Amino acid sequence: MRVGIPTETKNNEFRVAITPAGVAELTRRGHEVLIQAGAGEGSAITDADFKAAGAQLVGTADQVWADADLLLKVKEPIAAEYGRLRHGQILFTFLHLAASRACTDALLDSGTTSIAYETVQTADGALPLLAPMSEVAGRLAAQVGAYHLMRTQGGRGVLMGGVPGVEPADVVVIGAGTAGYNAARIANGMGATVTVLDINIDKLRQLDAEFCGRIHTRYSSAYELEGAVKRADLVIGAVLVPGAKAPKLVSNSLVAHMKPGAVLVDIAIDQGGCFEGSRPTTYDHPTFAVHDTLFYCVANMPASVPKTSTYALTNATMPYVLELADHGWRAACRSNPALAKGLSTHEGALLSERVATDLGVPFTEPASVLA
Amino acid sequence: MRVGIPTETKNNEFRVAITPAGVAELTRRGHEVLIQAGAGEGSAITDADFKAAGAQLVGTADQVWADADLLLKVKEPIAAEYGRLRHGQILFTFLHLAASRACTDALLDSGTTSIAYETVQTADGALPLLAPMSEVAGRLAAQVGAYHLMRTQGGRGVLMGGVPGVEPADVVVIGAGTAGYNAARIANGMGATVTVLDINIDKLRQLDAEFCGRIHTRYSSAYELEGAVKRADLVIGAVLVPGAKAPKLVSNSLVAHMKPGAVLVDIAIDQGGCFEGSRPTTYDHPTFAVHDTLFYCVANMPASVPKTSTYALTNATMPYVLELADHGWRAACRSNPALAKGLSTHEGALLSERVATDLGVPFTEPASVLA
Amino acid sequence: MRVGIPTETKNNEFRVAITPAGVAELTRRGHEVLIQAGAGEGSAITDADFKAAGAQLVGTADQVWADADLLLKVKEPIAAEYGRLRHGQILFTFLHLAASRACTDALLDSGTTSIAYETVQTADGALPLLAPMSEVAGRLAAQVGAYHLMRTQGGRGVLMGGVPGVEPADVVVIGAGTAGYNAARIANGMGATVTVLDINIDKLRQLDAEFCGRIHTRYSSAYELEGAVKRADLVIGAVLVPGAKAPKLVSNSLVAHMKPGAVLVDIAIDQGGCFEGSRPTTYDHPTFAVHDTLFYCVANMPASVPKTSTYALTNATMPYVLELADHGWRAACRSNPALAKGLSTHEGALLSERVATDLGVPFTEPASVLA
Amino acid sequence: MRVGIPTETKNNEFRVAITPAGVAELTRRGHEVLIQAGAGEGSAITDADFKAAGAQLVGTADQVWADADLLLKVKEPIAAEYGRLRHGQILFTFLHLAASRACTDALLDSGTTSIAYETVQTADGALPLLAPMSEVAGRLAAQVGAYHLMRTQGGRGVLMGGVPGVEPADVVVIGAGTAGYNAARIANGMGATVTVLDINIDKLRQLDAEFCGRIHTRYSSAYELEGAVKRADLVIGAVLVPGAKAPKLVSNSLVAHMKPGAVLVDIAIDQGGCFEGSRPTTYDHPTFAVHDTLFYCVANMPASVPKTSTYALTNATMPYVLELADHGWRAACRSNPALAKGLSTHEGALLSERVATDLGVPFTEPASVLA
């Protein structure tokens, strides 16, 4: 089997979907690894480091996409890449299909077989391949939120943690999962007063236990959500139902009642946004205004700390990459139920129910492709 | 007596030297309070809020400077203000005289009588008027340091706290006083591994006690400083000898051997900078490069979070402002040795020994002006 | 049924496989309990204490081995005990068969039926009978490691926790399971800077959550493993694949590049050792040298704190002892899949797959012995 | 002035009274530094390291003692060194004179001028040169106490921290000063339940605040002392009255009522011992028995971790060494009242009142030697 990794083309995307250690393991097992030259440059991995591990460097993107049986990526295919999608080829990357009909249609029309990092799910309900990017983004959201709270950046001009005698910032985190817990933890470490909302009370119990009383928890009812968002300096949206679109929890009329200069960071923007006003932005133009608040909506957040995120991602992905490479996609998916649950696309068939329900028709096929 | 507060004119300076509560106290005691129109706008204090407390609003800066016996500021007089300096007037603000020959010269030449906030010193050695601004700055340094470590900003692209399985950022703080303790505390809260250096072992003992083992402490010898700074992702300089220039502890050749994309935040920039390459910068152009590292040297740091810092500052200054207004400068200074230590300038005489020795001649007069 | 407990014969083994409370439960249910006189003396349990609970005291070891249907021990049979092994007898103890061809062969040849404490495994993957001994050994490892770091015992002469102004010891723990978590917790409590490595990222996540940032986590790749071990003063090997031999993770060539006087504690020595140079030692001669480092390799660790470890063990084992005594071995194993997983040996058949593949041939039989 | 450092001669004493950084400072100021060849070897400081800093290496001890105006040591002169004591020479070291009539007499008869590290005391009551050795010894006491609690070393066989479901060791620390606070902190970090006693309630308050409820505090009356010691597994004596002999707080009759295998560590053994049965031991024979308990009585404790303790000591002593070298002993003592408090001996006169009243006659002279 032939494994390809191309350079990420999305705006400011510095991650790469493999490191030399991973190349070494693949080649040890007799697979060939093709890598677009310069693909690891964002993450400070030279073409030479890749070579030394047994990779064949290739001059252009086109030659990675043709040739490769298993295409490993970080982000979803962008428009300019739709034409590179092949019929007898496995695509393994973050897809976020429920948020992009165009990407979904491009996968279905090309007949490619695709597996989403973010829907790979173990029996206990964890998402081990999203988890590490949720950790990075949760932590990032508190830092960038803290920074944009300065007057100098258009925020209301309060210091996260206050100083003795003077009140700290008021931070609300919607969602007590991986990203939410990490956002809350960092925000609390900077001295903010932190409140997190979720519909799952057990998630609130764990948070309550972990910090004794320090992080406040509220049940995420409409009343309770409005009360907290109204008073907040910084709101972080970190909500998920694993493969689904993402509920609109904060309306524009709500934001109209917020303190001027408040900042809202929508981690749930890949996947759709959990604020009504959310729209994907980029690291070049990260923010925009909604009634006197400032919105921060970068899809692709982990990309700005590639030294951390590249390693965090590939430590998690490799064992699945190896299962795919050794056994081919079906069989890997028959042996590994968590990998099966990541199956999204095959020969024009939409294999994920949540995506299908949210996208209107398509219509599912379950996993009678697994025969 | 007549108390004047003008609008701050330094770049991006949003603080104001008094709040309504302070105005009300002054007025209740029979003093007149003159305030430049719009002085509190940066801090969200309206001209109307100031009136309600008993202040006379004045259309121009010039009328505040002429007329006021006691002039309250936040920052030092800047060049455009040198001509406003008067002979029979008390100026109470942050001066940082050892770092500016020009400003010292202008104070001497005008015959003004000046008290520096930053050299008001209690018997125990504390600096109660600097302390709140060192708190804000120390906490800001960690925040802005974390942000500039993103590849997106020119930094090396590591997340402060790392994520499980991946190392965190390596933070070194030079100086374990108010600013350095606070920078250390926030850096630690964001999950960084933190080392602080000082020549004062007792300061190191306190920090060791407060965080059990969590914050590492190193005795600040040349060898220990070089070792730590070489390995650092973020270096925060927080050194002071109370009225003095500030030693150059980190040489350019040392920074030549640092990791590419490291960031150095020099909180000791007012006062002169403790890195050899430091130079005062502004919120409009905060950073610049030195051999592949990024330097951050905003004099003026607390200005960006005025909602926090204006209150933190005036909570501390008000009792001293009251002593000055009720009794006049000599007598206030005869009564309160902490105030006497802040005496910098009177009728062409330099009253501060540290400033004097550092500025070359001038030559001290001690406080036989207190008669 | 008749239950026998002999005196432990291994070097410095002070534990006993049962306490008076356990004897009393067995007796209440109509079983006979035979105990070698003096078996509880290492753990401060007198012959009289055992009598009061309903035990028959027996003068010699031989009479316990013959006579007893269920033989409860703490350690594996040693060579002088091979001749005591009988055909229609249940042996329940720590076995570690993958580390001893001889002990395995002796059980096979004797036809005895044996269940290993260390492979009794519940549905969630936990090893409830190993666990309390991993807690003791993990906590012991940090203690004894701390001690042998003194120059006086051959170590490099650094204090675990340092003192303010001076760096602490650098501790690496390989394996984030029960013993690793416990070693890290105590090492950290003593002020050391602690890094733990594992291939299981979820175990890294738990450890990151429990101590906030305080215990560092590193993904266990060969590169990360080398980096960390090279810099360490104390290395603790706590790696564990349930019934298997144990990977050699630290080569002799690697130890040759370690700081002189470093100490390596191999908790995984029962089971084979995870350092290349490891070899079982005893409490009489616990350490030996390997290239200027000091190895500590006591199989048997919990034996030195029997007041703690005898109770910790028997609190966990008793419910399983009761099921075996009441129902006999098959039936107990038919009803309790956790107990079935501990089945090692019966009438010349090796019942553990991991042991079988590690020992070369033998060849498995699965549990068609359960009929 | 000429400064000499000889090799420490006490049993297992691996510390050295100076480091290369200290030699370099002395040399820079125009002083001569003479060092016995091999003096730094216990602390891994080579003869070459000392040369590079400007030191003259000397072949024998005798030549350091003759020749040197200022003689810097770590331990007190031992008997084989009494003949080396000279008239016009400053001795600066740990003395513990109230515990040795012989050493005192030898200093008196020789006419030497001696300053004790342990009685150098600042205005606030702190002992800055003792302090770093009390930190090391306090942390060591918990480590070595933990170790000797193993049955394998004669202790009762309880693990410091217990394990879930089983009780931890019960630790009592007598004295809540530097060593006591440090012993408690490490004991607690290892999971023991820790009670500390002192007659100074404010020290009890500090310790209650620092650990919230976690470290128990008891007022040290005879009733409370007996109650706590009777129930303890580990007792640490850390009591300290600055220059005095040290009260016998724990009688032999009391130890007769202790649990068998209990361990008593007498940190206050330099200075005389605070247990009736205490007697100075060495690292070669650290322990002895007293009524079924085990006593640990190493005078000299910090010597086993010289990598830590040499730096901790010399970081504190250097500024005082510099004052002595530059100005000579009187003058240094006239300028620095803290140094004056360390004055012990001059031309046959005993200058310490506490030592004098404890040793019976001698008789004080105060510091009319300072003229």
Ligand SMILES: NC(=O)c1ccc[n+]([C@@H]2O[C@H](COP(=O)([O-])OP(=O)(O)OC[C@H]3O[C@@H](n4cnc5c(N)ncnc54)[C@H](O)[C@@H]3O)[C@@H](O)[C@H]2O)c1
């Ligand atoms: N592109 C990026 O920069 C990036 C990176 C990582 C994660 N994310 C996104 O962050 C979001 C959350 O990620 P995660 O891994 O923490 O998910 P998670 O599965 O761990 O947590 C989701 C949590 O949100 C909660 N939730 C669902 N509906 C809710 C509601 N109506 N009100 C309050 N809480 C609700 C759930 O109960 C759950 O506890 C996802 O949309 C994910 O895609 C984005």
Ligand SMILES: NC(=O)c1ccc[n+]([C@@H]2O[C@H](COP(=O)([O-])OP(=O)(O)OC[C@H]3O[C@@H](n4cnc5c(N)ncnc54)[C@H](O)[C@@H]3O)[C@@H](O)[C@H]2O)c1
């Ligand atoms: N303009 C601003 O944005 C701003 C605001 C606040 C404070 N500051 C500056 O921050 C600096 C720190 O102020 P602070 O209140 O924390 O001071 P502080 O007096 O409380 O502490 C300073 C510490 O530096 C240590 N130090 C002195 N010399 C040293 C050396 N050579 N090596 C290592 N440590 C040394 C001292 O021992 C002391 O503990 C000052 O320069 C102050 O002016 C700037």
Ligand SMILES: NC(=O)c1ccc[n+]([C@@H]2O[C@H](COP(=O)([O-])OP(=O)(O)OC[C@H]3O[C@@H](n4cnc5c(N)ncnc54)[C@H](O)[C@@H]3O)[C@@H](O)[C@H]2O)c1
């Ligand atoms: N005889 C004794 O004194 C004594 C007592 C108790 C336990 N032990 C030994 O301690 C060892 C650890 O036991 P435990 O109960 O903690 O086991 P555990 O299963 O709870 O955890 C072991 C950990 O090792 C990790 N691991 C496996 N392979 C790894 C790899 N190659 N790199 C890094 N990590 C890896 C696993 O992921 C797991 O998290 C076992 O060998 C056990 O027998 C010895």
Ligand SMILES: NC(=O)c1ccc[n+]([C@@H]2O[C@H](COP(=O)([O-])OP(=O)(O)OC[C@H]3O[C@@H](n4cnc5c(N)ncnc54)[C@H](O)[C@@H]3O)[C@@H](O)[C@H]2O)c1
């Ligand atoms: N040689 C060594 O290895 C070594 C090293 C360092 C310290 N020490 C010894 O440790 C002892 C403690 O030193 P330290 O630096 O912690 O002293 P310290 O002065 O900081 O504290 C000693 C404490 O003992 C308390 N104390 C005095 N009388 C008491 C009484 N009768 N009952 C209860 N508490 C009482 C004091 O109140 C004080 O808080 C000293 O003897 C010191 O010499 C030995």
